[PDB]
Amino acid sequence: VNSFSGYLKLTDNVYIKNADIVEEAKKVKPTVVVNAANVYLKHGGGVAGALNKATNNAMQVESDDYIATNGPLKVGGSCVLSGHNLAKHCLHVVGPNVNKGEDIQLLKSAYENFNQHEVLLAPLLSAGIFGADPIHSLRVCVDTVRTNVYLAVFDKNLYDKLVSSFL
Numbered sequence: 001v002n003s004f005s006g007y008l009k010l011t012d013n014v015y016i017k018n019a020d021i022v023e024e025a026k027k028v029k030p031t032v033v034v035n036a037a038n039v040y041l042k043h044g045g046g047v048a049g050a051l052n053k054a055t056n057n058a059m060q061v062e063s064d065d066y067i068a069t070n071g072p073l074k075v076g077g078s079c080v081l082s083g084h085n086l087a088k089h090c091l092h093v094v095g096p097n098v099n100k101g102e103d104i105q106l107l108k109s110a111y112e113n114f115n116q117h118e119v120l121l122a123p124l125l126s127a128g129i130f131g132a133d134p135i136h137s138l139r140v141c142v143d144t145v146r147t148n149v150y151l152a153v154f155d156k157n158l159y160d161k162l163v164s165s166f167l
Ligand SMILES: CC(F)(F)c1cncc(C(=O)N[C@@H](Cc2cncc(Br)c2)C(=O)O)c1
Pocket: 020, 021, 046, 047, 050, 123, 124, 127, 128, 129, 134, 152, 153, 154, 155, 158
């Protein structure tokens, strides 16, 4: 039993809710919140900018130190950093950005990072400003993630479309 509430169950292990991931993180304090990161951990907009703003820029400060030490992530890769006031940990995961021409096949590799964590609160990778089709992202999520994932979808119209078209 966990503290996630109001989710619709899509599969044995994938759940979905129309919610603001920032507000959901603030209420649940999950062990892991996933950030829709880029390879530079520059949290300017989309989910990343919203999460970072909610940490009063502490996420960005920590991220800049991480990059200065380790260099950029790989597209499809991830790193675990602090969750600050939102979660115990933040798993920064880099999905491919279609608006940069990155290969969409890397979306499966990106979701594989979720399997290293038993339970996660997450957005749909490569959705929103990353330019992928969220319906495709949900399909890859369901077919790749085996751990328990609670997906927060900010846009109500998109949420209803994701549920209604789900196979
Ligand atoms: C063009 C379109 F029709 F596909 C479209 C339009 N608007 C929003 C999205 C979207 O992917 N939203 C997700 C992911 C998300 C993105 N950025 C910020 C947050 Br916070 C959450 C959501 O709401 O959870 C997609």
